[PDB]
Amino acid sequence: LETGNTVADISLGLINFLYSNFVPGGGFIVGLLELIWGFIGPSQWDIFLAQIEQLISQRIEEFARNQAISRLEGLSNLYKCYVRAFSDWEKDPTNPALRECMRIQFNDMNSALITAIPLFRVQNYEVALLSVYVQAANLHLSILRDVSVFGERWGYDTATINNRYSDLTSLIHVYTNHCVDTYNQGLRRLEGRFLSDWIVYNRFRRQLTISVLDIVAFFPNYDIRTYPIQTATQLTREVYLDLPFINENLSPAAVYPTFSAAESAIIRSPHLVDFLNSFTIYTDSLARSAYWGGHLVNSFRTGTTTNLIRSPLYGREGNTERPVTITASPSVPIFRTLSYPTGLDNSNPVAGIEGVEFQNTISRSIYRKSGPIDSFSELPPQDASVSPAIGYSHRLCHATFLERISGPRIAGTVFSWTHRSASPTNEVSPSRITQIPWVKAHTLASGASVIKGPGFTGGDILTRNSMGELGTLRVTFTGRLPQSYYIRFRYASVANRSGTFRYSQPPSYGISFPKTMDAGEPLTSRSFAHTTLFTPITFSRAQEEFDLYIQSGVYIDRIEFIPVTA
């Protein structure tokens, strides 16, 4: 019985927790132990390394490799002691002896992490180590936040607490930049000329978006000065499954599409987040082999279910069987596909999909027949202790199509998914600092473009080549009205720039974007900063519509709502 991606399983369980429980205290301290550091043994760390080693065709040098694994086992034992010292100290916090135990454990944990981290980026093996690096970096930022919140009650003096907060602040950027830089270099190494190369490249991007980049996106939340109450990051990136090939050694290379052809056909260029409303699937055939030969997609954007965007036609509109319609909705998403690729018979003349079962949270719909290629394998549910309809991690977003009519015939349907944290409603609650990426807007103003994100924000970003509007973003305030919030923007800027913030009522507000970078340098962790509107706004309608006008040279990542009280 096939196992599925155990690293994806562990990662998405961790992501679920980071989204739902990112708030200081023993619950978070025990959560990391229960989900990672008291759960993963050397057996499983081996798989972490090997999953990347197989993708890049490079085994970590053996001494460095066993050094990493035993170092991770060392951190597990230390973190067990740390959690134990915290549970103890929590019950009798004034006890000077318990306070000394925690100060000892923290000092031990921090030192072990300071020395272990470089062993997770050993020269020439940084990519293969990257998913264990991100786990150690995460643990490090978490205990540095721990001391920033509790260190005084543990008995640390003011200077060392300030020193650790300065460490947290610098290392958010250092760890972020290392993960993104290493990820980009791993991707570059997998660029090649042919479709066979694209398959590996596309798998790498999926597997490391989930096991590394998705965790990096939460790193800024560990800054308690910036996020003094609970906050949740939305992962808005699209992740893609595989082309419907069984044998992925596509030979000879000359008879198959190029790398650029596949990338350009399969990966949607940057856009506002959308959600599946329906597929219309057209069945075609070659002699007696029937397959998914083309389709339309109908999508809606966040908060606005009634304005559907119809895709251009993918593939051909065959008539071998009547068109089939597959539907989803905001609260009835499709969370699982079971695909039957034609290549399950080595003799079929088309590379494509003979059938798919779609499972939604209520019922099922089958295009032609069910198959064994299971979305749960690469995108497992974020909670396995509960039914799949309750515990899924991703919702079916879109489907693209690599078409080759001549040569070996290709009907390359590929499914794309959005993570559960990117809800189809931008909800703002007075008990959270709410983060809303601007790609969750529902209109894109003319002259505004969605551009590819750097890698650490969790999704794509907005900019303009000349001053003007981004587009309207819809919000629903939950709970008893009225509510008052400070507005804050995460942005990057090549110069001192400004903008204007509007909602559907007449008071508008100027926003400033002090320079964060130089024109022409790449976006890196420190290129993004926060800017705050210090006049709070009070809202009294549940549904609200926001606009942002910006000058050029500004990149917008997200808007944030900081409750004035509660």
Numbering used by the authors: 28 to 593
Text of the article:
Two new modified Bacillus thuringiensis (Bt) proteins, Cry1Da_7 and Cry1B.868, with activity against fall armyworms (FAW), Spodoptera frugiperda (J.E. Smith), were evaluated for their potential to bind new insect receptors compared to proteins currently deployed as plant-incorporated protectants (PIPs) in row crops. Results from resistant insect bioassays, disabled insecticidal protein (DIP) bioassays, and cell-based assays using insect cells expressing individual receptors demonstrate that receptor utilizations of the newly modified Cry1Da_7 and Cry1B.868 proteins are distinct from each other and from those of commercially available Bt proteins such as Cry1F, Cry1A.105, Cry2Ab, and Vip3A. Accordingly, these two proteins target different insect proteins in FAW midgut cells and when pyramided together should provide durability in the field against this economically important pest.
The Cry1Da_7 protein described here was identified by applying methods similar to those used for improving Cry51 against Lygus spp.. The Cry1Da.844_8 and Cry1Da_7 proteins have 100% sequence identity in domains 1 to 3, and the full-length proteins were observed to readily undergo proteolysis using trypsin (data not shown). The resulting activated cores are comprised of the same pore-forming domain (D1) and same putative receptor biding domains (D2 and D3); correspondingly, their receptor utilizations were expected to be the same. The FAW activities of the Cry1Da_7 proteins with and without preproteolysis were comparable, suggesting that their PTX domains (domains 4 to 7) do not impact their stability or their receptor utilization in feeding assays. Consistent with this observation, the Cry1Da.844_8 and Cry1Da_7 proteins were also comparably active against FAW in insect feeding assays. There was no detectable difference in insect responses between the Cry1Fa-SS and Cry1Fa-RR colonies for both Cry1Da_7 and Cry1B.868, suggesting that the Cry1F-resistant colony was not cross-resistant to either Cry1Da_7 or Cry1B.868. Potential cross-resistance of Vip3A-resistant FAW to Cry1Da_7 and Cry1B.868 was also evaluated in comparative dose-response bioassays between susceptible (Vip3A-SS) and resistant (Vip3A-RR) colonies. Both Vip3A-SS and Vip3A-RR colonies were highly susceptible to the Cry1Da_7 protein, showing 50% lethal concentration (LC50) values of 11 and 12 ng/cm2, respectively, and all insects were dead at concentrations above 316 ng/cm2 Cry1Da_7 (data not shown).
